Structure 1
């Protein structure tokens, strides 16, 4: 009953994206090749999806949540600030016929300690935007670590790897660079890089001390 990388990637290509994306919210979806590789690794290498309660922070239209549910999560909960994004996700959840999914509209930066150590795994492709000197991906990362009991899987810029590792030592949590991914933003996007790929991201696995 197991799913190979190519099969999962082909199924994630059926996930409908942002209809009218919001530029200030960084509404770009995780590409099926990026998402499949990421999820396949979480389940096959670390076994952090099957019979787990997973949280998807900034779930958008659901790419990472739909794949997590398909890999055997007991429950996958997606969190997003935008209603329009969750309506597409809710539609994808109905169409894929996935019954192990839930959704919450909220600000991940303004989350309550009501969900402290309430999830087994937290997965995310967070926004990178600067919000009062702090990058959103790091504000999402501190929330994720407070919520996850076992692991956090996140995408952070490779250029800023030094700051992520420095914060892991400060937070006294384990860190592991799983992969170095290189994807471009949707071709629809107006301001692409001309000397390189748009996003040079690191797939990172954060874990806790025993």
Structure 2
């Protein structure tokens, strides 16, 4: 059993972006957020161990590193930026984690080959507007198509009513499991996000 403080202490040692790309909203998931999110996914919902997990917008890999340490069968990170994946790969090597893979792609443009290809999808998506939609809602639609069992995502608490409305329209189950906050890189202060678990009717 990996205790919560140990998990967080390990995730403090994940290296971040050398040159974050502002237009891609590149910043690492904060270790306190990542540890609480992953610990809950594992210990409350048992949605990591022996599962195949996708991390959308995996960045430098904080969420994927933690997922691999909690016993995923395989965690596959997806990111549009080759520079982020190079850092993610180095992190995986420094942690000696071999249950990880990664793919460079635009998450909003994946083919239907990805349909129902993972047990669980986790993500800290970007929020900027793209084609009249928040990018996190485009990530969410993709994640729900990819996931067989559950999606865990972070969305702005100020957008909660919209996320609930879309979940109702999509006939998806939604549960707000935590209200969190973290600071953005100084160049951008506080952001209030919901940790949300999406799941499916049987």
Partner Cα separation in structure 1 for residue 185 and residue 52 of structure 2: 30
Q: Which runs of 5+ in 2 are unaligned?
A: none
Partner Cα separation in structure 1 for residue 109 and residue 191 of structure 2: 27
Number of residue pairs matched? 202
Residue 188 of structure 1: CA displacement?
A: 5.2
- The superposition leaves residues 93-126 of structure 1 with CA deviations (integer Å, 9 ceiling, x where unpaired) of 1110000000000000111111100000000000
Q: Which runs of 4+ in 1 moved over 4 A?
A: none
SS, match of residue 60 in structure 1:
coil
Q: Which runs of 5+ in 1 are unaligned?
A: 190-196
- The superposition leaves residues 52-100 of structure 1 with CA deviations (integer Å, 9 ceiling, x where unpaired) of 0000000000000000000000000000000000000000011100000
Partner Cα separation in structure 2 for residue 154 and residue 172 of structure 1: 17
Residue 186 of structure 1: CA displacement?
A: 2.5
SS, match of residue 69 in structure 1:
helix
| TM-score (structure 2 length as normaliser) | 0.99
Two-structure CA RMSD over aligned residues (Å): 0.8
- The superposition leaves residues 187-207 of structure 1 with CA deviations (integer Å, 9 ceiling, x where unpaired) of 454xxxxxxx52100000000
Residue 132 of structure 1: CA displacement?
A: 1.4
Partner Cα separation in structure 2 for residue 118 and residue 128 of structure 1: 25
- The superposition leaves residues 149-197 of structure 1 with CA deviations (integer Å, 9 ceiling, x where unpaired) of 00000000001100000000000010000000011112454xxxxxxx5
Partner Cα separation in structure 2 for residue 148 and residue 60 of structure 1: 20
Residue 47 of structure 1: CA displacement?
A: 0.2
Partner Cα separation in structure 1 for residue 50 and residue 17 of structure 2: 29
Partner Cα separation in structure 1 for residue 186 and residue 96 of structure 2: 30
Partner Cα separation in structure 2 for residue 87 and residue 47 of structure 1: 30
